[PDB]
Amino acid sequence: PLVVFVLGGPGAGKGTQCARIVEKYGYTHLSAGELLRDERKNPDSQYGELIEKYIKEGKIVPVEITISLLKREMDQTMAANAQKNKFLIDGFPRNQDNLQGWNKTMDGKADVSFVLFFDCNNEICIERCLERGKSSGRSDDNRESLEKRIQTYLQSTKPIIDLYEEMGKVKKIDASKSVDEVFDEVVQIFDKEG
Numbered sequence: 001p002l003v004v005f006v007l008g009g010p011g012a013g014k015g016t017q018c019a020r021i022v023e024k025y026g027y028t029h030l031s032a033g034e035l036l037r038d039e040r041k042n043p044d045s046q047y048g049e050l051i052e053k054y055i056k057e058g059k060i061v062p063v064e065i066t067i068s069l070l071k072r073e074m075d076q077t078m079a080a081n082a083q084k085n086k087f088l089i090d091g092f093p094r095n096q097d098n099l100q101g102w103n104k105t106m107d108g109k110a111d112v113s114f115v116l117f118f119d120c121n122n123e124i125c126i127e128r129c130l131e132r133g134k135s136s137g138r139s140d141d142n143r144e145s146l147e148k149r150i151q152t153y154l155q156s157t158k159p160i161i162d163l164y165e166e167m168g169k170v171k172k173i174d175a176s177k178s179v180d181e182v183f184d185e186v187v188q189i190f191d192k193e194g
Contacts, residue, residue: 010146022088067102
């Protein structure tokens with residue numbers, strides 16, 4: 001079970017590239033944020049009632065639940081099809097405590113091949129989020145909530161990038177270019193490694 005973590009703030013173009021990587025390379029894309037939201041909404045589910053307790057208390061849902069959901073999706077995907085063993089994971093990790101939790105709980109159970117980091121300047125990210133907003137119903141987010149979210153994402157994930165750099169595992173991508181230019185960069189990486 002091989003994992004690639006996909007990092008980058010909002011507007012960085014992750015969504016488009018992940019879909020592209022899934023088609024060409026047969027990776028399975030997991031969204032940590034959407035797996036949690038769906039577990040919460042099923043009160044039927046494994047962890048729905050547990051998540052309900054944390055919500056009631058005004059408390060953050062522990063990363064341990066998130067890792068369990070990621071691990072269950074990986075285990076189920078492979079029990080159906082032992083060949084579908086490569087995973088793109090986004091929405092996790094969000095900070096270095098999340099990442100320590102992963103490394104303590106998942107060693108001997110999954111290998112992180114590498115980390116993809118979609119990088120470009122705040123302004124271009126922000127414009128993307130705003131134009132996606134306008135052109136559909138409308139966004140909750142205005143310019144200054146976006147800039148705040150981008151700033152604190154870069155601050156939170158910097159130690160993750162620093163750490164994976166140290167072991168030669170960061171593949172930086174220039175996310176300011178157009179969809180197909182960026183994907184050419186993504187293809188150079190995945191054709192090499194895997």
